[PDB]
Design a protein around this ligand. Structure first.
Ligand SMILES: C[C@@H]1C[C@@H]([C@H](O)CC2CC(=O)NC(=O)C2)C(=O)[C@@H](C)C1
Ligand SMILES: [K+]
Ligand SMILES: [Mg+2]
Ligand SMILES: [Mg+2]
Ligand SMILES: [Mg+2]
Ligand SMILES: [Mg+2]
Ligand SMILES: [Mg+2]
Ligand SMILES: [Mg+2]
Ligand SMILES: [Mg+2]
Ligand SMILES: [Mg+2]
Ligand SMILES: [Mg+2]
Ligand SMILES: [Mg+2]
Ligand SMILES: [Mg+2]
Ligand SMILES: [Mg+2]
Ligand SMILES: [Mg+2]
Ligand SMILES: [Mg+2]
Ligand SMILES: [Mg+2]
Ligand SMILES: [Mg+2]
Ligand SMILES: [Mg+2]
Ligand SMILES: [Mg+2]
Ligand SMILES: [Mg+2]
Ligand SMILES: [Mg+2]
Ligand SMILES: [Mg+2]
Ligand SMILES: [Zn+2]
Lengths: 217, 136, 49, 105, 155, 44
RNA sequence: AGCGCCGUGACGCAGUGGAAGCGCGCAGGGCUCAUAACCCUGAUGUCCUCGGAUCGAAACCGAGCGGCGCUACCA
RNA sequence: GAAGACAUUGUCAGGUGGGGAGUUUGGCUGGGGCGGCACAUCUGUUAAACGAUAACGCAGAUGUCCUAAGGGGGGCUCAUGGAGAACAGAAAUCUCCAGUAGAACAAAAGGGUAAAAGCCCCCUUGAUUUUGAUUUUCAGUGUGAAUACAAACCAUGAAAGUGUGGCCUAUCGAUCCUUUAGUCCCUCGGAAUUUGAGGCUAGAGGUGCCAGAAAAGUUACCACAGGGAUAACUGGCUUGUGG
RNA sequence: UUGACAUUGUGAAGAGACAUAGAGGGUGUAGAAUAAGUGGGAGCUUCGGCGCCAGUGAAAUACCACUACCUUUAUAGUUUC
RNA sequence: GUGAUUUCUGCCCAGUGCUCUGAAUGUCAAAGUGAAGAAAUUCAACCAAGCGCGGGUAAACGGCGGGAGUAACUAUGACUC
RNA sequence: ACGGACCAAGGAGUCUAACGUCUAUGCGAGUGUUUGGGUGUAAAACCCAUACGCGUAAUGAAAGUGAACGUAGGUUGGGGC
């Protein structure tokens, strides 16, 4: 047994889906999320946990990611359908922080080739680190469609400064069996990153993009 | 309270198990100590019984019933002249009152196997090597 | 010490046991005494059995 | 050392009795769980006067431990324990080796 | 079928190894009162006229910088931590808490920025840029930044 | 000699440990300066 | 006799198996009538030798050299 | 007169406590001490051509490392030299010839291996289950390691076949206690149910003084039992050193 | 030495914690209003009013955010300094 | 502790000790409190002193460094690193 | 190397509980009277009931179950007849 049993989640998720699928018909997509709270836990004193796992299927394929990389990766990413940006156009963009301020905003994530290490910090500024989006490595043998599927599906848990975190673990328009599975994999992944496991969580809110933010515990 | 061990400066001279001074308990009750002191005070009488009457944090208070073995009202009156027998001299000093039989453990059953016919007598019997003429 | 193929013995003689040895030399005397007590009691309570 | 999280091996679960798929985890000891008879005896022996009553080990020599693998059949949930040799670093299902790759220095 | 994925840790092994007392050296590491320390002074003396040796040891804690002293017979064993240093590349430093990157792009946003004379100089050398390489010492479940170097080549 | 006093013994005459003694020390230990807030000559 | 440690730029010293760094010193220009201070810029190393293991050693191993040390007690 | 439900006193609980108590303070060792490890082990030699064989003999090594560096199959041949090919040079890649291994096989050393045991590639988990027998150390005990079958379930291959970890020789651990797995079994003894506890079979947590106590000194204030099994003076053998 | 219980009875006036709910932005520069944060993301309403874009910053603004402390507030009570 | 008089009694509070604060926090026993349980019990919060953190103190215990260059004969080095 | 000037007298593997191998004796699937009773020429000798010990059943942690397929098996030796 845990603090959460899949039965209680099964009954919250049903009317959570029944609201979005039946009642309110908005002209755009609806996304289900997970929000977590932390209690008796102090970011300044304690250890800032950091974890991510490969979620089985992507919660939202409608997010824009830019392919930093060398000639080989840009060549196989320009044919993929993902915006592949070179290394020699960034060469003197460091002149102005505004030139890269828009770069971080438009792309929901960044992944770069293994030559990112020497370059991406110093070629750019520290904005990407500040923004919470730092490029993740991709190898020459790693199929780039594999990473852009993986990096799009993975959820990252990070204790940055505040006791509240939130990862997105689905879109509404899936069948309900995989929704209860993934909402249940993400909660006990989150507790596994804590000192006392379930004894540090004090808030678990699951919901959909626009409506009834159900509390769980 | 407890019976502090009356060794000078707490220095017991022996093994660590016997190094205790403070958390040691007297094997007789305070009611038996009360009976001892009253019987010594009134050595011409025989302690019959005692009971609790009161207590505060420092003292427990008891009342002792004593019988006069010389009074002719007690020497006659068959229901009580057993106490005039010499065998009942200082029965409270030998643990023969109710509190003394309780502290000696004198009761029936398996819970009192150590102390039924007196524990030192039980120990002597259990620790006696009995040899017969035609050895068994 | 432990030596040879011999059974493990459990002779409980590590106390002052020689102070509590009872030898029943008085077996014959106490049997005579018991018969004497029975005879005197029979005489006292006669003819009760 | 690096061991996969998944492994096909023999399951003696009275319904498999054959090689089935297993999930691999590392064995963790578990809480000492007082009210165990040895813990009750120890508490009774340590109560009172007499000091420390049992040996207290001091002469540590080992620096590693044997790793025990907890194998769970995916068909009947029967579990089995396997023992590996001593190691300093142990990991499960991570970063299969790359053969012909340049050194990253 | 099953759930929760049985997420675990997959750990083992000791943070200290027992080696000796007389085999220690200055600039080596030793555990004193459960703290990791760097030896700066060790001396040996005979205890009597036909007795044996004892080692007096003076060492600085590798994290708090405090002096610790201890003494032991030269032939008993003491613990030595498994002190390790790691290269990282210096990304942003925002609320202290230097965010670092390994030889791969994997990030360590876990280590407090040093608040001492080395840490403030690190921040000043970081504000104008000139990407740094910071060394992290990580003995006995504690981590700390101890040095920083300007990259040599590839300007 | 050491049998007589905490300061006794030695191949030279010296106290050997701090002569400042805590208030919570026990009888036989309070030889020297007991619960001293400071020692040494006043005003340097 | 046995044992331990050290050797890095002219000097004093750091140093994470991926070709070496601090402070002065030195060099070039400037300011001054000139030197110093000051300002702007550069340069300086078989890491004591000679072999070995490693893809690659300043670090590890073997020797050789030069210094510093420690033990030296009961008789 | 002061003080007052506070102090005090009782019991339990945490701290402090060489003031005091009890105990300990390994072994081997050309006396002991300091040093070292010859204390559990492995390679070569000493070792005197079966086996065994000592020393604080000699030269070294071990407390690890590995999902492959384990298992099978396939294809190929290594170090090195010569001759050649823009930059390219003594050292970058390419080609041919010669090449018995002069390479490689995690790590000491020794042994072993060429259509392989090396290198590259394709699959995979036999590094599995149940026990018994055997070899070495040996008391023919344990522990560690290993060998050959049996009964299953598998991997690989066209197949013969091979595979019960690492090409072989080292790479490690009882009782008590704790913990997990298995049978879902046995017991809690007045009779049941459910917790809890205890059992049976098999792993782990560790004893490196490695057949496995829980352990700091000093003594010229010293004590006892002994020892010429053992040092310091004389004698004896030797004579490097001295002459 | 420190805490608790007992000894141990009789009383009042300022604080302060538990649970329900309503409130709340507190700032430096500056978008377009005075910005306490992080995740999602272009819609219901009589207002096209607001967000999207483009300017603005350390960080976007409609909306879902009864989520995250933090700062206040009125309770039938229950607890302590 | 030192040891008549005279004349002096330098520098060092990092360590060990002694001593003094705070409540901004870490550790934190028994009793008491809350929650889960059928209950034994388990978990959590609160949590005194001490410790920890931070000051003071050497007529407290005590301690009180290396190397190199440099003067118009050399040598030394007032000076300098 | 130590003990021994001389002589007399004394002066050191005992008894007990439990037990192993061997041997003797009795009876033998049984065996053991002597706790006790009876009796007596009285600590002897003689007589004795019921029990109890060991043995005739093992194995298992335990709940439990529990010894002939057969001339109580086959093969190889085997004294004696
Ligand atoms: C060191 C720890 C304990 C140790 C062991 O139980 C220690 C002793 C304790 C004792 O009093 N008697 C014994 O027979 C063993 C053990 O088994 C290790 C694996 C784990
Ligand atoms: K002693
Ligand atoms: Mg008790
Ligand atoms: Mg106690
Ligand atoms: Mg003292
Ligand atoms: Mg003393
Ligand atoms: Mg003297
Ligand atoms: Mg003592
Ligand atoms: Mg010895
Ligand atoms: Mg041994
Ligand atoms: Mg031979
Ligand atoms: Mg057990
Ligand atoms: Mg001799
Ligand atoms: Mg000569
Ligand atoms: Mg005086
Ligand atoms: Mg002075
Ligand atoms: Mg408590
Ligand atoms: Mg001194
Ligand atoms: Mg003699
Ligand atoms: Mg003589
Ligand atoms: Mg004589
Ligand atoms: Mg005689
Ligand atoms: Mg005799
Ligand atoms: Zn199965």
């Amino acid at each position: 047994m845990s603090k959460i049993t899949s039965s209680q989640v099964r009954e919250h998720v049903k009317e959570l889906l029944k609201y979005s699928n039946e009642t309110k018909k908005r002209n755009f997509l609806e996304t289900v999320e997970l929000q977590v709270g932390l209690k008796n836990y102090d970011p300044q004193r304690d250890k800032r946990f950091s974890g991510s796992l490969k979620l089985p299927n992507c919660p939202r394929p409608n997010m824009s990611i830019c392919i930093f990389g060398d000639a080989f990766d840009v060549d196989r990413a320009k044919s993929c359908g993902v915006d592949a940006m070179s290394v020699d156009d960034l060469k003197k963009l460091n002149k102005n922080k505004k030139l890269i301020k828009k770069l971080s905003k438009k792309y929901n994530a960044f992944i770069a080739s293994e030559v990112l290490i020497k370059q991406v910090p110093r070629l750019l500024g520290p904005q990407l680190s500040k923004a919470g989006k730092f490029p993740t490595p991709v190898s020459h043998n790693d199929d780039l469609y594999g990473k852009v599927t993986d990096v799009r599906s993975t959820i990252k848990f990070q204790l940055k400064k505040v006791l509240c975190l939130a990862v997105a673990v689905g879109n509404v328009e899936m069948e309900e069996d995989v929704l209860v599975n993934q909402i249940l994999m993400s909660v006990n992944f989150f507790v596994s990153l804590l000192k006392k496991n379930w004894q540090n969580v004090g808030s678990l809110v699951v919901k959909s993009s626009m409506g009834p933010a159900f509390r769980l515990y | 309270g407890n019976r502090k061990r009356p060794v000078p400066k707490g220095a017991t001279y022996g093994k660590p198990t016997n190094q205790g001074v403070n958390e040691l308990k007297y094997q007789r009750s305070l009611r038996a100590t009360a009976e001892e002191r009253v019987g010594r005070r009134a050595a011409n009488l025989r302690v019959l019984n005692s009971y609790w009457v009161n207590q505060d944090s420092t003292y427990k208070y008891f009342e002792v019933i004593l019988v006069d073995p010389q009074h002719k009202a007690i020497r006659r009156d068959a229901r009580y002249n057993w106490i005039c027998d010499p065998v009942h001299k200082h029965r409270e000093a030998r643990g023969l009152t109710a509190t003394g039989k309780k502290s000696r453990g004198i009761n029936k059953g398996h819970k009192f196997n150590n102390t039924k016919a007196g524990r030192r007598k039980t120990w002597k019997r259990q620790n006696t090597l009995s040899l017969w003429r035609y050895r068994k | 010490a432990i030596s040879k193929n011999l059974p493990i013995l459990k002779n409980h003689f590590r106390k002052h046991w020689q102070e509590r040895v009872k030898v029943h030399f008085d077996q014959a005397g106490k049997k005579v005494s018991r018969r004497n007590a029975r005879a005197t009691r029979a005489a006292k309570i006669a003819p009760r059995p | 050392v690096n061991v996969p999280k998944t492994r096909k091996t023999y399951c003696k679960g009275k319904t498999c009795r054959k090689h089935t798929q297993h999930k691999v985890t590392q064995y963790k000891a578990g809480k000492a769980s007082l009210f165990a008879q040895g813990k009750r005896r120890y508490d009774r022996k340590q109560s009172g006067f007499g000091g420390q009553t049992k040996p207290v080990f001091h002469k540590k020599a080992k620096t590693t431990k044997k790793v025990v693998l907890r194998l769970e059949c995916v068909k009947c949930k029967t579990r089995a324990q396997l023992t590996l040799k001593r190691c300093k670093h142990f990991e499960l299902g991570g970063e299969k080796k790359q053969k012909g790759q340049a050194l990253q220095f | 079928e099953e759930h929760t994925f049985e997420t675990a840790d997959a750990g083992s092994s000791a943070a200290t190894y027992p080696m000796q007392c007389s085999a220690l050296r200055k600039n080596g590491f030793v555990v004193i009162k459960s703290r990791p320390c760097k030896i700066v002074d060790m001396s040996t003396s005979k205890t009597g006229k036909h007795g044996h040796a004892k080692v007096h040891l003076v060492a600085i804690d590798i994290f708090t910088g405090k002096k610790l002293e201890d003494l032991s017979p030269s032939t008993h064993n003491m613990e030595v931590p498994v002190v390790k240093r790691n290269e990282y590349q210096l990304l942003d430093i925002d609320d202290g808490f230097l965010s670092l990157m390994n030889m791969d792009g994997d990030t360590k946003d876990d280590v407090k920025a040093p608040e001492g004379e080395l840490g403030d100089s690190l921040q000043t050398a970081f504000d104008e840029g000139k990407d740094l390489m910071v060394t992290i010492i990580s003995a006995m479940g504690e981590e700390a930044a101890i040095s920083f170097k300007e990259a040599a080549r590839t300007d | 000699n050491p049998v007589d006093h905490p300061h006794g013994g030695g191949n030279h005459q010296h106290i050997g440990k701090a002569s400042t003694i805590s208030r919570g020390a026990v009888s036989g230990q309070k030889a020297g300066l007991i619960a001293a807030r400071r020692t040494g000559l006043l005003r340097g």
